[PDB]
Amino acid sequence: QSTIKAVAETISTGPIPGSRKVYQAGELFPELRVPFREVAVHPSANEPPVTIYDPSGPYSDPAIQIDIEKGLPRTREALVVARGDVEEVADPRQVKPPEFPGRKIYRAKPGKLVTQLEYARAGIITAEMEYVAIRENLRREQDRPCVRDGEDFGASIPDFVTPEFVRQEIARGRAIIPANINHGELEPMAIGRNFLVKINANIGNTVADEVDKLVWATRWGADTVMDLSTGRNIHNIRDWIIRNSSVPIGTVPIYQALEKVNGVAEDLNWEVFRDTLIEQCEQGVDYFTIHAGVRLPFIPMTAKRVTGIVSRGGSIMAKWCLAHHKENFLYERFDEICEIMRAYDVSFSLGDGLRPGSTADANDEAQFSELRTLGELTKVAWKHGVQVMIEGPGHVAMHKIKANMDEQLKHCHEAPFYTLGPLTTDIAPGYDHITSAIGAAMIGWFGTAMLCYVTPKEHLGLPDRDDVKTGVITYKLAAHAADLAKGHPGAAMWDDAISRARFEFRWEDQFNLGLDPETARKFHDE
Amino acid sequence: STIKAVAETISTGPIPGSRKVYQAGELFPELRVPFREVAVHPSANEPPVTIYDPSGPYSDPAIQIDIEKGLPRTREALVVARGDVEEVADPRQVPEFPDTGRKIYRAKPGKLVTQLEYARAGIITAEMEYVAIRENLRREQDRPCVRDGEDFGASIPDFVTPEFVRQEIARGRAIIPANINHGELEPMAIGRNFLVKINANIGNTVADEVDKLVWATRWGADTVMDLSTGRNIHNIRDWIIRNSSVPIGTVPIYQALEKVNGVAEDLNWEVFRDTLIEQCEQGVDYFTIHAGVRLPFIPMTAKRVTGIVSRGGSIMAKWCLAHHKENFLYERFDEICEIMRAYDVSFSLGDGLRPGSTADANDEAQFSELRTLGELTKVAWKHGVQVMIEGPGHVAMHKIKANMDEQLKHCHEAPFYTLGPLTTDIAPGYDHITSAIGAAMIGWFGTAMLCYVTPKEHLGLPDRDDVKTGVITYKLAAHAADLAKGHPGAAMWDDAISRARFEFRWEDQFNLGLDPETARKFH
Ligand SMILES: Cc1ncc(COP(=O)(O)O)c(N)n1
Ligand SMILES: Cc1ncc(COP(=O)(O)O)c(N)n1
Bridge partners, residue B23, by sequence:
B33
Provide the phi-psi class of B39: left if phi over 0, else alpha when psi is between -120 and 50, else beta: beta
Q: A391 a known binding residue?
A: yes
Same domain, B453 and B313: yes
Nearest to B183 by CA among B114, B274, B247, B226: B247
Distance CA A328, CA A335 (A): 13
The helix/strand/coil state of A29 is coil
Contact B246, B220 (CB under 8 A): no
Nearest to B211 by CA among B54, B10, B64, B65: B10
Distance CA B234, CA A165 (A): 64
Q: A148 a known binding residue?
A: no
Distance CA A166, CA B508 (A): 50
Same domain, A117 and A247: no
The helix/strand/coil state of B466 is helix
B310 alpha carbon – ligand 2 mean position (Å): 6
A311 alpha carbon – ligand 1 mean position (Å): 6
**B380 Cβ neighbours under 8 A, 6+ residues apart:** B333, B337, B347, B386, B387
Burial A136-149 (b: 16+ CB within 10 A, else e): bbbbbeeeeeeeee
Ligand 1 nearest atom to the CA of residue A353, by list position? 11
Last residue before each gap in chain A (C to N over 2.5 A): 97, 101, 205
Contact A30, A11 (CB under 8 A): no
Q: Which residue of B202, B310, B327, B389 sits with most ligand 2 atoms within 8 Å of its CB, as the best mutation to test the pocket?
A: B310
* Resolution value in angstroms: 2.1
* Residue A87 C-alpha from the chain's centroid: 27
Distance CA A421, CA B16 (A): 29
Helix (H) or strand (E) holding B50: strand B49-51
Q: Which ligand is nearest to the CA of A314?
A: 1
Helices B206-218 and B464-485, interaxial angle, to 10°?
30
Helix (H) or strand (E) holding A106: strand A106-108
Between the alpha carbon of residue A233 and those of residues A18, A257, A356, the distances in Å are: 40, 12, 31
**Strand order from edge to edge, sheet including A50-52:** A20-25, A33-39, A50-52
Contact A495, B425 (CB under 8 A): yes
DSSP state letter for B303: T
DSSP state letter for A253: H
Contact B124, B164 (CB under 8 A): no
Contact A389, A191 (CB under 8 A): yes
The single-letter code of the amino acid at B504 is F
Same domain, A145 and A242: no
Last residue before each gap in chain B (C to N over 2.5 A): 94, 204
Peptide bond into B393 cis (omega under 30): yes
Q: Which residue of B267, B286, B419, B450 sits with most ligand 2 atoms within 8 Å of its CB, as the best mutation to test the pocket?
A: B419
Nearest to A42 by CA among A409, A518, A497: A497
DSSP state letter for A297: G
Instruction: Answer with the one of A164, A194, A224 that is the final residue of a domain.
Output: A194
Cα A15–Cα A17–Cα A18 angle in degrees, nearest 5: 110
**Contacts of residue A359 in chain B, CB cutoff 8 Å?**
483, 491, 494, 498
DSSP state letter for B394: B
B515/A430 CB distance under 8 A: yes
* CB of residue A420 inside a 6 A radius of ligand 1: yes
A427/B305 CB distance under 8 A: no
Same domain, A330 and A479: yes
Cα B451–Cα B457–Cα B460 angle in degrees, nearest 5: 130
A520/B428 CB distance under 8 A: yes
Distance CA B515, CA B519 (A): 6
Peptide bond into A110 cis (omega under 30): no
Q: How would DSSP label each residue in A15-53?
A: --TT-EEEEEE-SSSTT-EEEEEEE---GGG--PPEEE-
Handedness of CA B233, B234, B235, B239 (dihedral sign): positive
B513 alpha carbon – ligand 1 mean position (Å): 24
Helix (H) or strand (E) holding B400: helix B397-410
Distance CA B201, CA B453 (A): 9
Distance CA A61, CA A192 (A): 28
Closest-CA residue in chain A for B437? A438
Contact B467, B200 (CB under 8 A): yes
Instruction: Classify burial at B484, counting beta carbons within 10 Å of its beta carbon; exposed 0-12, middle 13-18, buried 19 or more.
Output: buried
A419 alpha carbon – ligand 1 mean position (Å): 9
Instruction: Classify burial at A505, counting beta carbons within 10 Å of its beta carbon; exposed 0-12, middle 13-18, buried 19 or more.
Output: exposed
B522/A306 CB distance under 8 A: no
Nearest to B74 by CA among B86, B62, B84: B62
Same domain, B224 and B305: yes
Contact B21, B34 (CB under 8 A): yes
The helix/strand/coil state of A431 is coil
- C-beta neighbour count of B23 within 10 angstroms: 16
Same domain, A380 and A448: yes
* B389: containing domain: 1-13+194-488
Helix (H) or strand (E) holding A234: helix A234-243
Same domain, A359 and A501: no
End-to-end alpha carbon distance in chain A? 46
Same domain, B322 and B240: yes
- Give all strands (DSSP E) within B240-380, no chain letters: 248-250, 286-289, 346-349
Distance CA B236, CA B226 (A): 10
Same domain, B173 and B73: yes
Same domain, A181 and A201: no
Distance CA A160, CA A163 (A): 10
Bridge partners, residue B416, by sequence:
B389
Nearest to A374 by CA among A357, A390, A393: A390
Radius of gyration, alpha carbons of chain A: 22
Backbone angles phi, psi at B346, to 5 degrees: -90, 150
Instruction: Answer with the one of A194, A219, A237 that is the final residue of a domain.
Output: A194
- C-beta neighbour count of A151 within 10 angstroms: 17
- What CATH code is carried by the domain that includes residue B247? 3.20.20.540
Between the alpha carbon of residue B136 and those of residues B7, B270, B469, B489, the distances in Å are: 33, 44, 27, 8
Distance CA B219, CA B472 (A): 7
Bridge partners, residue B348, by sequence:
B288, B388
Name the method of structure determination: X-ray
Peptide bond into A394 cis (omega under 30): yes
What's the number of domains chain B is made of?
A: 3
Same domain, A270 and A408: yes
* CB of residue A311 inside a 6 A radius of ligand 1: yes
B517 alpha carbon – ligand 1 mean position (Å): 28
Distance CA A276, CA A268 (A): 12
Instruction: Classify burial at B41, counting beta carbons within 10 Å of its beta carbon; exposed 0-12, middle 13-18, buried 19 or more.
Output: middle
B476/A520 CB distance under 8 A: no
Q: B290 a known binding residue?
A: yes
Peptide bond into A422 cis (omega under 30): yes
**A44 Cβ neighbours under 8 A, 6+ residues apart:** none
Instruction: Classify burial at B62, counting beta carbons within 10 Å of its beta carbon; exposed 0-12, middle 13-18, buried 19 or more.
Output: exposed
* CB of residue B310 inside a 6 A radius of ligand 2: yes
Helix (H) or strand (E) holding A317: helix A312-324
* Residue B464 C-alpha from the chain's centroid: 20
Return residues 339-398 of A near B (CB < 8 Å): 357-360, 397-398
Distance CA B444, CA B487 (A): 10
Helices A432-446 and B464-485, interaxial angle, to 10°?
50
Nearest to B317 by CA among B327, B330, B307: B327
Backbone angles phi, psi at B130, to 5 degrees: -45, -50
Closest-CA residue in chain A for B492? A360
B247 alpha carbon – ligand 2 mean position (Å): 16
Three-class DSSP labels, B442-460: HHHHCCCEEECCCCCCCCC
Distance CA B494, CA B508 (A): 12
- What CATH code is carried by the domain that includes residue B516? 6.10.250.620
- Judged by a CB distance cut-off of 8 A, whether residue A514 touches chain B is yes
Handedness of CA A146, A150, A155, A161 (dihedral sign): negative
Helix (H) or strand (E) holding B408: helix B397-410
Distance CA B195, CA A121 (A): 54
Instruction: Classify burial at A117, counting beta carbons within 10 Å of its beta carbon; exposed 0-12, middle 13-18, buried 19 or more.
Output: buried
Nearest to B58 by CA among B95, B97, B98, B6: B6
Size of interface A-B (CB pairs under 8 A): 220
B251 alpha carbon – ligand 2 mean position (Å): 8
Nearest CB to B459 within list A399, A474, A524: A524
* Residue B316 C-alpha from the chain's centroid: 23
Q: How would DSSP label each residue in B359-377?
A: GGTT-HHHHHHHHHHHHHH
- C-beta neighbour count of A327 within 10 angstroms: 12
Distance CA A243, CA A210 (A): 13
A485/B458 CB distance under 8 A: no
Contact A465, A424 (CB under 8 A): no
- C-beta neighbour count of A230 within 10 angstroms: 14
Q: Which ligand is nearest to the CA of A394?
A: 1
**Strand order from edge to edge, sheet including B49-51:** B19-24, B32-38, B49-51
Q: Where are the alpha helices (DSSP H) in A109-206?
A: 116-121, 127-137, 163-171
Distance CA A225, CA A93 (A): 24
- Please compute, for residue B2, the number of CA atoms within 13 A of its CA located in the half-sphere on the CB side: 14
Q: Chain B closest CA to A425's CA: distance in Å? A: 6
Helix (H) or strand (E) holding B473: helix B464-485
* Residue B131 C-alpha from the chain's centroid: 14
- C-beta neighbour count of B517 within 10 angstroms: 13
Contact B441, A398 (CB under 8 A): yes
Distance CA A452, CA A390 (A): 12
- C-beta neighbour count of B422 within 10 angstroms: 32
Same domain, A46 and A82: yes
A428/B515 CB distance under 8 A: yes
Nearest CB to A425 within list B432, B461, B479: B479
* Residue B114 C-alpha from the chain's centroid: 18
Helix (H) or strand (E) holding B398: helix B397-410
Contact A46, A65 (CB under 8 A): no
A498/B425 CB distance under 8 A: yes
Nearest to A491 by CA among A197, A174, A239, A233: A197
Backbone angles phi, psi at A301, to 5 degrees: -65, -15
**Contacts of residue A484 in chain B, CB cutoff 8 Å?**
358, 396-397, 423-424
Helix (H) or strand (E) holding B215: helix B206-218
Nearest CB to B494 within list A426, A461, A477: A426
Contact A15, A120 (CB under 8 A): no
Distance CA A28, CA B173 (A): 63
The single-letter code of the amino acid at A33 is R
The single-letter code of the amino acid at A263 is G
**Contacts of residue B356 in chain A, CB cutoff 8 Å?**
499, 502-503
Helix (H) or strand (E) holding A176: strand A175-176
- Judged by a CB distance cut-off of 8 A, whether residue B16 touches chain A is no
- Indicate the pairing of strand A249-251 with strand A224-227: parallel
Contact A35, A19 (CB under 8 A): no
Nearest to A289 by CA among A187, A474, A418: A418
Nearest to A161 by CA among A125, A187, A107: A125
Instruction: Answer with the one of B166, B193, B220 that is the final residue of a domain.
Output: B193
Handedness of CA A282, A284, A289, A293 (dihedral sign): positive
Return residues 442-481 of A near B (CB < 8 Å): 442, 445, 456-457, 459-461, 473-474, 476-478, 480-481
Contact A462, A123 (CB under 8 A): no
Q: Which ligand is nearest to the CA of B457?
A: 2
